[PDB]
Amino acid sequence: RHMGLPDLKVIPGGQSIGVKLHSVGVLVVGFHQINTSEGKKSPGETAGIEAGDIIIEMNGQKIEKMNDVAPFIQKAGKTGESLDLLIKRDKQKIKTKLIPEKDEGEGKYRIGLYIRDSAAGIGTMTFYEPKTKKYGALGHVISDMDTKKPIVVENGEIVKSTVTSIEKGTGGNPGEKLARFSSERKTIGDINRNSPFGIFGTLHQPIQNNISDQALPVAFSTEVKKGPAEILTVIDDDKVEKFDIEIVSTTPQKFPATKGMVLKITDPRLLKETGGIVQGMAGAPIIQNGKVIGAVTHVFVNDPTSGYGVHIEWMLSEAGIDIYGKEKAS
Known about the structure:
It is a single chain. The protein is mainly β. It is built from 4 helices and 21 strands. It has 2 domains: 210 residues, Thrombin, subunit H; 79 residues, PDZ domain (Pdz3 Domain), CATH 2.30.42. The protein is 9% helix and 41% strand. 36% of the residues are buried. Its main location: membrane. Its EC number is 3.4.21.116.
């Protein structure tokens, strides 16, 4: 019948980062036509496959790279009996046995599958808790360009990145950032979870922002207030700077959900230099009243001065971190 639980504290990020997600197996993103002696049909569609299907094992053999199919295509022609490889749909394994045609120009065989092995993106680091070195970034799920389903994580990594310029566009929406991944390929964290609330990993060594590198308390949504707030993000080189914003509206979500705050960009400098929210600000953290309250997750389709944010506690849950202050052993 006693009292006294402690408060959880994270360090705001704001650094521009590159994100590389290595999918489990390889990811089928679509289907492809190959030349048949008589008629024209595609094996994968007939075999029993669809966009977003992950081909973890080819005839019982696990695949870890795009190059892994190169020995398989020649070998598949020779035996020519069936391709019985197993796919993974959601959490359900699916086994389809189908046979390879050929590509006329090269003179080699074809599989008729369009496939990709990874996803790549520029975003913003949201926070890291120091004792566990764990970090949360992006605030939203990473998806495939064509399938629009989530990349299932084998592993992944993050890197420093830079904003080299902002370019006006005569045709289309005007303001666009051009960003620079790290060709030194220094992996500062790994990625162990691609989630609706973001990508969560362990950092190699603590990072710095030179603006807000002191652990702050984290808020529940009932504590969010309409009105001024602040964000952290990079608009020149790799320097993280504060930007005045406003919580236009805030919902006290009673279960995990995506768009718990509506936001408005009111800082003049950002309003000039980007017009508001633009690409790479996907993990940029939102600080109100000395508390980290969330991350920038969306721009309005037709309003770059307004957007959405995700409440911090759904990110913290996904990251294994208890927000009530409890601590796990070892």
